[PDB]
Amino acid sequence: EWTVDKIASALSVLAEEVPQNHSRLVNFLLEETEKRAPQPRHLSKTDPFAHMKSKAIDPTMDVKFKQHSGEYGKSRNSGRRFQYPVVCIKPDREPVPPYRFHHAEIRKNILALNSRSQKIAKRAQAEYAATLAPYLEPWLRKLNIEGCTKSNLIRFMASSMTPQQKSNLLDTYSDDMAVRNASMFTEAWDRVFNDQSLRRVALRDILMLDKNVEPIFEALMQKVIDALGSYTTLGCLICFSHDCEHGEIERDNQKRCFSLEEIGGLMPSLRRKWAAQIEQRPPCRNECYRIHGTGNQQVPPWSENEVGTLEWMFATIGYSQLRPECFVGAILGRPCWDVHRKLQELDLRLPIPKQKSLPWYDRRKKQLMSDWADATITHEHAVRELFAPCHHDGPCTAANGCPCASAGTHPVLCERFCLCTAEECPLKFTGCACHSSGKTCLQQREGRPCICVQLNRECDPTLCKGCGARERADPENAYDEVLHSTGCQNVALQRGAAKAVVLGKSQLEACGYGLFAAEDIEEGEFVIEYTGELISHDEGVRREHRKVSYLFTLLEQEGIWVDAAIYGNLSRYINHATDGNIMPKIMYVNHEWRIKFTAIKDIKAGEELFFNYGDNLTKKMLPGRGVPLLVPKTTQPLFDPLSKVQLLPGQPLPQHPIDDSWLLLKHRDNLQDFIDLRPEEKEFLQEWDAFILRRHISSEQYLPRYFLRFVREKADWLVSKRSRGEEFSKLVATLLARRVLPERVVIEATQVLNDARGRLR
Amino acid sequence: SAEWELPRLRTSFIFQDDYKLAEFFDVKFYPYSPPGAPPVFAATSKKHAVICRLTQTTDKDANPCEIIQLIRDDGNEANCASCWSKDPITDQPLLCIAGNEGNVKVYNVTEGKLYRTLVGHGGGINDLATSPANPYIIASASDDTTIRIWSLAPEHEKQPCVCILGGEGHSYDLLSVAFHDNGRYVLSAGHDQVINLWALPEFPNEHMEIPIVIYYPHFSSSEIHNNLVDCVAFYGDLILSRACHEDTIVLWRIEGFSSDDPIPGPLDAPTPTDMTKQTRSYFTPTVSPQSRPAMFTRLAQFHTPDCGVQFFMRFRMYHVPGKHPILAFANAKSKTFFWDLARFGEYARFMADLKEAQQSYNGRVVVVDQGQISLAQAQQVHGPGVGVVMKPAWLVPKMVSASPDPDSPFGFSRETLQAWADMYDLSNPVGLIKAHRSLAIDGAFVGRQVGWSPEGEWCVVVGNGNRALIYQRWGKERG
Ligand SMILES: Nc1ncnc2c1ncn2[C@@H]1O[C@H](CSCC[C@H](N)C(=O)O)[C@@H](O)[C@H]1O
Ligand SMILES: [Zn+2]
Ligand SMILES: [Zn+2]
Ligand SMILES: [Zn+2]
Ligand SMILES: [Zn+2]
Ligand SMILES: [Zn+2]
Ligand SMILES: [Zn+2]
């Protein structure tokens, strides 16, 4: 009945629709625009220029006029020259110092990704594929050729893309094509639409962009591992967010997150909690199993996801002293005895080598000794390469291939995310011995030194007890002057809490901007942090090509840099001097490397801030730096960072809180662009991250408080949908496996969702 | 009756050389005069602002142009940008002027004094535009990469910067800023080859300590053109944009964009999450066969031949109620082009009627001009066998069939039809619309800007050598 010639003949007749429709569309869009022309507004009552007569004369300037007439051209006379008085107006203001881009403030360093004849052809072809794509199905119905359906044409195409991708397509599509007229149609489509000379398309190019093609490119524990997969893969060990500023960006913009899958996934961490629980040797208000046993009535039939919830909660709560019955109950909305019976039916079942102490470090007395600075690189950040923390069964030795011990020229102390414990491992960091009725962790008066100060690290809110870092590294106590008068003193970055500073024109000849003190700063006080985009050496090179540079070397050997070109803080304006009044230092801050500025002299309000940029500037191979408030009185003009309004002394100092929603949104969209995640997954991950990124968590010490704020705030939202509570329990399981969530917090989360559901009922 | 009348060269003037390369970079007519008031315009050279008034005359030998003011920027900068504003107290005309040192000088043109200076930009300003919704709102596009929204209202006197369109919108110098008639949407473009659509928030009637910072455009693309974009404008909700080395003004549209829909918030904007993608949009429609729907559509291409490698060359549409839409543009080889957009649809209705009559009457079609006699009268002359189609009088001769031979009584030649399709056919998005009127100039002239009088009877083109060409339609000259 059909042949290539006849389909090709038919397609040429149908293709005439395309220029017909385009003309109807364009004309329609133009007619609509004319009819909808704007009516002129804000017209004056009187002609404002009415009294102004010609300024001509037979400080002045000349104008020669010519008059024309006719179809072609045409000068009438030769022209007529005239003199006109000139009104000289001089501007009453100097422009502000120059810059490029809008300089936006960031609370902490953010992660940046890496940044012609073919371009034109591809674009011409893409635009053409876009216009023809909506005509394929209408044309296929009009033609009504047996077996010529879009699905069969895609089927034909997959029966030349990568071998794997052809199989993924064939998987969901099958080989049910016969009568494979899909051949004769393809041949005819390419003769008509793929003529070489532009704009052109092969049927495959249209098919490849189709919504159903383009995206298609022991036992209990295996279930639980797969179930918690997204949380272990993306959930951050530092800040607890699923799209954050932690992790590595590969040469292609693929990201290796700093997650549980960095620390060998779920199981090593889980096994260790179970072991810890064994060594360790209030009923719910939803028909508790502790009072109602197992029931005797009949329940609705449980779903796969419902048994899954009971499975991952059972596993992650482990050998506890907190029971899954209550929590799962409050998650699903089924009574407590109901899940206790399901658990009885399912019959679910759960699955120190003496090391020689180091002569350079004592973790018991919490101190360094006998030429420790030649035995380690823990404090030497500039020479430190970043590797994943410990995740091995044996001791932390070179012989056992421990990265902490063997990866560097010298060993490094085992940090909090290393799976080894303080008892089994001599390399483990344990914290501060430091305790005083006054100031400690300096910078130290009373007793032995501060091991943290020594190791170029800020104190750990969890490890540094009687410091009291716990309450001083809490951002909620940032402005508690009374609290900070007492011990530690080594939590500046965690506080932040920067000294009042003001932007202005630098005193340095033709330098542009400078940063000025807006408060008296004493010697050794924390001034400000250097924030920016975290970029690689290579990415930095690309930015240096396409006079003024904002790069700062963070981890030299590792090849990490901080670029404050667009994103950073006022510290980007601090100019160079061989002998400045401040100094940068690279600090280890809860598995983050951050730059802090410390005053090395007493600085007075109005005095400009200066520092030494280092090796890589004569105004007294990547080029970059390295190691009741009022507006002050100054010889230099000062400005608001955002508005650039010139400031005047004595005025209340501009102090604008950072709005990071623009940044929160980019993390929302980054998860929205993941194919590997289900929409039910993205709905929750985005909800949790939007919340947890706002709290800028660096230590697990504050997570239980924010977790509880999240339950209390989102309780109605969580109980209003089956997938939301399901996802939340996945998170809670992952966090319990890590030992990040105290039992009591989960017990309290049970009661929050239980009264939520009760109220909504 | 002469709604189809297109402009003709009436006057031309060379202003004294004031930069020693002297050129008029801008021309803008004052838009707040009462209806009937003589039009007043301002031509901005590198150092001066030449305020003219145009008066219709009966004498072909009389001069319609009178320079009612000539201001000189006595700063150390060179200017290229202008827009008109109003004093929010006295309703007196203000002329904003911007240049290479990054400031906006607002002049009290009637009193010959400086109103104020707007400081804040960190580079030279290439373009200025006033909000059609608020005469006190001004947008400035700069080398610093940002757009600054300023308010001349008394409320904002202390801090005039109401908004900064910054963040991740642009990476190089901006050459164009354009406002939507609703005053809520802004188009920006430049050297980075990106056209961005930004949605402005509502500005409080009170003091703003800091501007509202916008970080992401609601639509962003580098795919409409293949070079630096130096002119961008809205035509309703449609976009008109021009790029260097293309010899065209592209008419195109953002899929899913409508100003009838509620304005989206800042957090509704797409963010660059995938570095590969060169087009991103909040407006993108749900229904399409594509997994990644076409986010824009190329509609037509106005052919502006011989522009060369020149940039900072801008067009202008005359878009007013009860008058035809006229697009005017001047190239780099002494030529001024005009398109009467109202011709497209008339030609379109004509061609459809002609194809229909050709099919229904087996080619027996007689065409009669709309300038007498009547459709019913013509049918009465040729009888039932022949079909009659009415032609617009301006459509002069030389899947629609041409006459079999020259002496055939039905249809037109291929030459006639190809001439009409060159100028009026809109069926090909990558076609080339031939100007409806091309007026030559003497001798060498590169056009920088085009401006239309409120009543559309005057069209002023300004450019190199400090030259101004004045074109007029609906003249009163008694020859
Ligand atoms: N001691 C010095 N000598 C010369 N230039 C200096 C300097 N200290 C800082 N700079 C200038 O400041 C740049 C670093 S960025 C510092 C902020 C800058 N003044 C601004 O206006 O944005 C350098 O690339 C250089 O141009
Ligand atoms: Zn993180
Ligand atoms: Zn219970
Ligand atoms: Zn180890
Ligand atoms: Zn370790
Ligand atoms: Zn260890
Ligand atoms: Zn200490």
Ligand SMILES: [Zn+2]
């Ligand atoms: Zn400590």
Ligand SMILES: [Zn+2]
């Ligand atoms: Zn401490």
